[PDB]
Amino acid sequence: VVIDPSGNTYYNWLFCITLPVMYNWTMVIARACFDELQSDYLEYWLILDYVSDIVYLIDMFVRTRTGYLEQGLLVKEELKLINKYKSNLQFKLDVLSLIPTDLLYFKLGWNYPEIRLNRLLRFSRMFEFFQRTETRTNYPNIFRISNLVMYIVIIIHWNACVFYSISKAIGFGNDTWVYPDINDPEFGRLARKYVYSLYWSTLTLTTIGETPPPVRDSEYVFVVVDFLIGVLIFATIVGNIGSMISNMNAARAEFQARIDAIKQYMHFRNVSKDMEKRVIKWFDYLWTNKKTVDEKEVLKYLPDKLRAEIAINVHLDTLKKVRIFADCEAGLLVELVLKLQPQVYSPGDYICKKGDIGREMYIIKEGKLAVVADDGVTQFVVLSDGSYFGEISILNIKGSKAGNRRTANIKSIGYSDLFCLSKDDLMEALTEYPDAKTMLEEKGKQILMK
Amino acid sequence: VVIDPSGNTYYNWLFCITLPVMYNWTMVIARACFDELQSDYLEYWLILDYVSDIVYLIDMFVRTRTGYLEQGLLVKEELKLINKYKSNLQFKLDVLSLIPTDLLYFKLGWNYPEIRLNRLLRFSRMFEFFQRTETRTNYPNIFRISNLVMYIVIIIHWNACVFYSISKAIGFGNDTWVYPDINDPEFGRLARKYVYSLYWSTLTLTTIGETPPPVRDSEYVFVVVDFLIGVLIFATIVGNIGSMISNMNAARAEFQARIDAIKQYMHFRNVSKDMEKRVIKWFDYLWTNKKTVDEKEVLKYLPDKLRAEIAINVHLDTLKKVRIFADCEAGLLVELVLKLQPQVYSPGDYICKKGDIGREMYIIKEGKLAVVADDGVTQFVVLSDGSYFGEISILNIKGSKAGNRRTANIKSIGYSDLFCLSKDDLMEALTEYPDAKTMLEEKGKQILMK
Amino acid sequence: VVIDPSGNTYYNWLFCITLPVMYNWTMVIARACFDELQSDYLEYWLILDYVSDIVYLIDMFVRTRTGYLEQGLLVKEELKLINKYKSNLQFKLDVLSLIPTDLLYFKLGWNYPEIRLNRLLRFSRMFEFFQRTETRTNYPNIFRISNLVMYIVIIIHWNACVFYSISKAIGFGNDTWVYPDINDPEFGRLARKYVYSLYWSTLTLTTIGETPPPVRDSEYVFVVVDFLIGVLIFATIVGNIGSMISNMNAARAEFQARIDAIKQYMHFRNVSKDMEKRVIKWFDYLWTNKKTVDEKEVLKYLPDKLRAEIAINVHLDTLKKVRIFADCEAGLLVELVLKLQPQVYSPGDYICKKGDIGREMYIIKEGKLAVVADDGVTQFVVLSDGSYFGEISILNIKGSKAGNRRTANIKSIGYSDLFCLSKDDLMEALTEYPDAKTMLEEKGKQILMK
Amino acid sequence: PQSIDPLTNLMYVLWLFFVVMAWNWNCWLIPVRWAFPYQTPDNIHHWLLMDYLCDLIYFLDITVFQTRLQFVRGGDIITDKKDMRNNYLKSRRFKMDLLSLLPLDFVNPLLRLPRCLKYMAFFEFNSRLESILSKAYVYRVIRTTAYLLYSLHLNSCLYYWASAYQGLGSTHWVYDGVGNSYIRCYYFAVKTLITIGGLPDPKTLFEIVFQLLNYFTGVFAFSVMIGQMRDVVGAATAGQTYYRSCMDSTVKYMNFYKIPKSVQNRVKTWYEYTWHSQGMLDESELMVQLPDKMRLDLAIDVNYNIVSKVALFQGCDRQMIFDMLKRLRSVVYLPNDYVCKKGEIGREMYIIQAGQVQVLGGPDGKSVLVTLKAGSVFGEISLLAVGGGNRRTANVVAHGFTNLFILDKKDLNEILVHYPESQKLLRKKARRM
Numbered sequence A, B, C: 001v002v003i004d005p006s007g008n009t010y011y012n013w014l015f016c017i018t019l020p021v022m023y024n025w026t027m028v029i030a031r032a033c034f035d036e037l038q039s040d041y042l043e044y045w046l047i048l049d050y051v052s053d054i055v056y057l058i059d060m061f062v063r064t065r066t067g068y069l070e071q072g073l074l075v076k077e078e079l080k081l082i083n084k085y086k087s088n089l090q091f092k093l094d095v096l097s098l099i100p101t102d103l104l105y106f107k108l109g110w111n112y113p114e115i116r117l118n119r120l121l122r123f124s125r126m127f128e129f130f131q132r133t134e135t136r137t138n139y140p141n142i143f144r145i146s147n148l149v150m151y152i153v154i155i156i157h158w159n160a161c162v163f164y165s166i167s168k169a170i171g172f173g174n175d176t177w178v179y180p181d182i183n184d185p186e187f188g189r190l191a192r193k194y195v196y197s198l199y200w201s202t203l204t205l206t207t208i209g210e211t212p213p214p215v216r217d218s219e220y221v222f223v224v225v226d227f228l229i230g231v232l233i234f235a236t237i238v239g240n241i242g243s244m245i246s247n248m249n250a251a252r253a254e255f256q257a258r259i260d261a262i263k264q265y266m267h268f269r270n271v272s273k274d275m276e277k278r279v280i281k282w283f284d285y286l287w288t289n290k291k292t293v294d295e296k297e298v299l300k301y302l303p304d305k306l307r308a309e310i311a312i313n314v315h316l317d318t319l320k321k322v323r324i325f326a327d328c329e330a331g332l333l334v335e336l337v338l339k340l341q342p343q344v345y346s347p348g349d350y351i352c353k354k355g356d357i358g359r360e361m362y363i364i365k366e367g368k369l370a371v372v373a374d375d376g377v378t379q380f381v382v383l384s385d386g387s388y389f390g391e392i393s394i395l396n397i398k399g400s401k402a403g404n405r406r407t408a409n410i411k412s413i414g415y416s417d418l419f420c421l422s423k424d425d426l427m428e429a430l431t432e433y434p435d436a437k438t439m440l441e442e443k444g445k446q447i448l449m450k
Numbered sequence D: 001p002q003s004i005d006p007l008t009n010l011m012y013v014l015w016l017f018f019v020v021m022a023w024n025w026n027c028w029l030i031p032v033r034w035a036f037p038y039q040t041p042d043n044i045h046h047w048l049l050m051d052y053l054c055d056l057i058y059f060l061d062i063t064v065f066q067t068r069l070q071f072v073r074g075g076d077i078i079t080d081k082k083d084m085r086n087n088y089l090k091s092r093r094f095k096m097d098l099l100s101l102l103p104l105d106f107v108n109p110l111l112r113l114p115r116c117l118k119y120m121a122f123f124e125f126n127s128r129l130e131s132i133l134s135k136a137y138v139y140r141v142i143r144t145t146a147y148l149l150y151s152l153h154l155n156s157c158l159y160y161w162a163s164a165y166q167g168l169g170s171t172h173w174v175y176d177g178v179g180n181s182y183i184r185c186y187y188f189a190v191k192t193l194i195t196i197g198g199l200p201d202p203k204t205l206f207e208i209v210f211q212l213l214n215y216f217t218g219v220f221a222f223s224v225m226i227g228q229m230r231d232v233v234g235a236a237t238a239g240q241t242y243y244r245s246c247m248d249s250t251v252k253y254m255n256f257y258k259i260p261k262s263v264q265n266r267v268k269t270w271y272e273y274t275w276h277s278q279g280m281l282d283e284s285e286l287m288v289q290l291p292d293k294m295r296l297d298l299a300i301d302v303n304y305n306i307v308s309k310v311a312l313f314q315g316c317d318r319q320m321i322f323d324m325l326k327r328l329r330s331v332v333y334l335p336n337d338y339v340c341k342k343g344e345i346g347r348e349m350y351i352i353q354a355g356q357v358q359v360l361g362g363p364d365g366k367s368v369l370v371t372l373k374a375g376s377v378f379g380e381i382s383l384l385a386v387g388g389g390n391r392r393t394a395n396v397v398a399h400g401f402t403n404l405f406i407l408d409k410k411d412l413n414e415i416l417v418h419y420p421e422s423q424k425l426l427r428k429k430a431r432r433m
Ligand SMILES: COc1ccc([C@H]2Sc3ccccc3N(CCN(C)C)C(=O)[C@H]2OC(C)=O)cc1
Pocket: A205, A206, A207, A230, A231, A234, A235, A238, B205, B206, B207, B208, B230, B231, B234, B235, B238, B239, C206, C207, C208, C209, C231, C234, C238, D195, D226
């Protein structure tokens, strides 16, 4: 056996069925409208059509052997898979796409390859493969842009075929609007036929004009309808490509808009030039060091399990040095790694001051910190990455000199990333884990007595 | 070494390397496609190319001397900077850009400037400048529009060069689509060559048309591809420019949408004419003094510290007039300003009512406020800017009657800007400083007894 | 005075000064470029220029009598207003606007009316009026389209004048691109001259094309530059139009997305079909009566004192019918409406159930609510508009037969919308007024005793 | 019948569609008969018959369809031939309908120009169509397409009037008179309102003024058209775009920090399963948008009986049950995820909405000693213990994708402090067990 839809085998077969579906959606109408294309390379079209039909049969075989998800579990029962497949409209589409219409080659002739237009009814495999591709690829916006570009290309190709077939129905060279006479040596070439039809289709679907104006009323109707198709469908896909490119830089535009609003605020309230320069320095640091994105807003939809595993994988090295994690009973970390919030401090920021209410605990992701003196010029000791502090004032402690107030002032030399840990979150994690509470109380006592 | 990226010297060098990168991105393809441009100014192009290569070498030196942020601190070790820069893709792009391909002139001749196309590979430096300028320029929408207009000019000029080169490869004057024969006196001029190619490229990239139709298959194919380029990439840039121009007044867009929603509520709800006029007057005052957008929403994307001294800097002139802080220890304002909430009051609005519970400090930023008698007609002395009122109720004292209530009522003579500060925030600010606490207490008791 | 800027007199004078500024900004360049326009109506242009200059003098007099808000109060001092005006850049722009350049006529002749181009420097007044209009119009998007169309027409008119000036400098009729020969009777018509120039400028500044191609190099340069300006103009038009479309359809798209999300939630879950129908009908009732937006998230921007009396004026008929509100004092009604919450109810929601602890007491502002028994069909009493229930569960009586629980069941009839007051908010308002804290208890005791 | 509900009657939607077709006939055919010479006396009776049929539709709507439309003024008023009709007569709809039915006989089609003023019926029919018809962006595409078609229709009629005003074929700009007049004037309207160009250039002053105004209106109408289609596609694909944006931001976050492909594949699998099944990334954002009664009732109709089935919550007050139903957090689990671990402490109760879980035990694990289907509840004993002194007896895996509800500790405590009677009930239940 049973093919899993989320596996690589199913995606590989999605590509292997998208190739004949793209081949049909281009070349069936290409050969139907351009008769010379069908007649000149008819052996190649026969081989490719037979291969595409074989792949269509194997695709219907796969659809009887692909497992659906019933109550969250993959179904391996072959009868259930076959019944599910045949109950869907996809089975009807596959049967309609694989009715053998090539027997009409023996009735209508070899120059009528539109008889296998029903092979276009495998478009759902194309769309399923494109939905599955953008999930797997590392450049989903680029792939979406290319897919919409492809849609533009196939719509232009279809309109080129329709223009050539309409010129054929009216007659080649009867007036200036239609494609010229085939007996012309330059305009009788198959390459010139398709390429000039593509040129007309591109100029009309982009609403440019610059083509011979219509003469007959049917040509006027078709030109009006094609310009309308180029204004409501083609311009829509062009705007969709523009919207995908806008969605590429959605976070970039949001960050820049926030910067611009802050700068407008500083411009109106007559903020001093030094403070404006240092705000710009903070934002330049934010963009340069790639800290413009917050893991809280990006991962807010993810569960606690997946956010926990991602945050352990991101913060493995910095949480290794922390004493309460991986040295104590070590079941605490999963409860706290969700609860840690990242904060960034500029050089010279005073993260806590003596006599200030300590409602939060800091774990140094990175950055040099310093337990400074009262004036701040003298540094007692430098805290490195992985160090944790602020634990003395966040908890009630026996023999507390001050209580609920910071005992030392710590300033960051250089920038610093810290895991802020609020008092309520720490108490939530520590009321259920007494060993970590005892260890943290002992650590707090060791510095507080000194 | 060491060059700080956040410094102004780094930005100046970003400009000084952006100039030769733009010079290359224009003139290399311009001289590659227009042979007369290279031939007629060969010595000037040689001097400018040597200058650009020298600036590229100095940019490589700056990149070796540019300090990166490791563990929060700036790296000043020379070998660390060499090994950091030498391990990036930027070093490979700089080496490939400064490959001395000019030795190819002797081999391929003086008519092949496209061997200097590798000098385009410094483009990221250019982009870095556009990231650094846009962050720091006081007119970011104007710079963004100018940057995308410059991108339009680059793409149009490149397509002009491509059109001229394709006409050269096909043959000048061979058919009606290509550039005309360059032995003609009018069209053989270099200025005419460039400006007609630029006119053709402007017409084609804007999907105007109005150019001679193609004759050859390759010409039709190139016109299809270039119209597709002009409707995808060029029109995406057009849509981005239109989105930025329509959103230059982003704060005005939000405020005007707010006015429109509130006025739709008024008109659908059929509120009275007098108060509709009152709300219109309030929002007229909000726009006239440009007090529309709130500082919390704009500044909430900054750290707590940065907002703290931003609020120090903005209100400093009226914070120094405050009796509570900046007079006793000059450190209480550093302790707590961000808890103050600015609120604007209309003329005649009663800030406090007689004998009610008070939970706000109400520090006056601006406006004239009057203590009123109970009748409402006769008013006592008018409070000035920087004064404080309402501190009797927020902090109660034992032994004093009606301490929790309001001693008097306050009327706004005009539009008053006040700092509403919660009572718990005042306790948190005043537990650290007892001298300011008792200084407030003495005057509060004095005005409370009588 | 002294003229208040927020008054309607200032807006009327803004229109009365905008008319000469628009007249200058269009007709000065119109007469400077079209010589027959200046020559044929020279007396009318002299009269209109003198009138515009007189209105400019009166406008500078107005800015000496336009008060500004310092300390929230309008300045009535004449000398202070004069110094405030003269310190502004607008005084310099107005003085430069009214430098008498008509004397240069006697040096230059009457065919040079560009000498009074400095009258354009009053442009800010023009902008200000439209700014004020966008704040005070009842049709904001109609005026936005009018403003955009007006600005594009001024730019197109200016470029038409520029095109005619370029045709004049090159010489009329020397090639196919310039305006044709003035000596020709058809082309020499002043209306034909201006209208064809405007047609050419509309074509070029909207990137339509359809103009004779340039012949000279300077013409090619100007057409490329003007098509780039037209790219900017068309992008501005498209962006403003699309932003208006988004602004008009924002509420529809958001509430339709809410409908789609709740539909997807109900289909994914196993919600019964009756509750699905009730949900869709309730949302449809909310949109049909156009009361989807809650009054908490729409009134939160304008201040609280304005918000309370907005709630008074909006729901005056409902609040006047309440036993609690406007009984004798009619003073609690102003305060309580802000903290009061709105909740809508489908028919048969069972707002209150017997055996449930009361969280809030409910104020019927609209709809008829019955007091049903356990059977759900028999109605004991129907509560009219402005009524109330839920009093005795959250209020405490020393002698109570119910242990903090609701005693009655209320079933909603006919799409009822009603107000709610929470229990903690009930105590907050209960500590305010003693008449309420005795009246609610004596009203609830009689209901509780039976 | 005698009194229909305009909000939810399909027959009223059909009649409103008929009124829409009559109004569309008037709007689309007044400029045709005004400009084009298609109202010759040979077939003038057809035009008069269809005009009088549309006027009869207008009269039927204004008399026997709009009068019997029930409304609400705090209650449903279905008073047949009473103030239900009077509300319609006091409404602006009746004023617009009577102003739109102005009789002008005097055969100029512009005298029927009041008939275009019955546009409120069109908007009412549209508003019914975003309600009763799912996938409503298709009708919005059709509506903006019809707006563009009508704009080109008006421009074609204006162009034919301009051509006949100057004489057909007098200039290369005007319509020459060869072939179908409407089709070629519509061709001019398409080449103009889309600003395609390519037309013969205007010569006389009237032609240049017409072409200038038509290009200006064309630029603005093309901008309106492209903005409308952009808005329709952006609103129709808003959920898909938001899901793709969140998923790609998550994916680039993992690729930034070099998350291994196993965890990345698990997160992508969660994203695709949540989007395909739930239709949204977080149901809680939808629930907080709703009124409180709707959210509470949806929690009821989802899992009220399933919650009430457990014996621990039996005997407690129903309002605590309502509150915990409001506080249940629905989360899906990938296959072979450890919902419970033996060493991990117990904090939360699991209520399987869908899927199967397996309790492992015995020698070295890997033995399904009991499997629980949808609707089961496990982990409730952890709710009883206070102070964190609870642990899972055995590890529980999710055999497949299991959507299940969470009632964690300090939330059950947060609603226990609201109900002291239930506090005593759960205290004695914890002491018994
Ligand atoms: C039908 O498919 C299309 C989809 C997109 C477009 C682009 S090309 C362009 C490029 C630069 C400036 C302007 C444009 N123009 C006007 C072109 N002049 C001749 C009027 C547009 O319309 C563009 O669209 C937008 C909404 O920016 C064209 C066709």
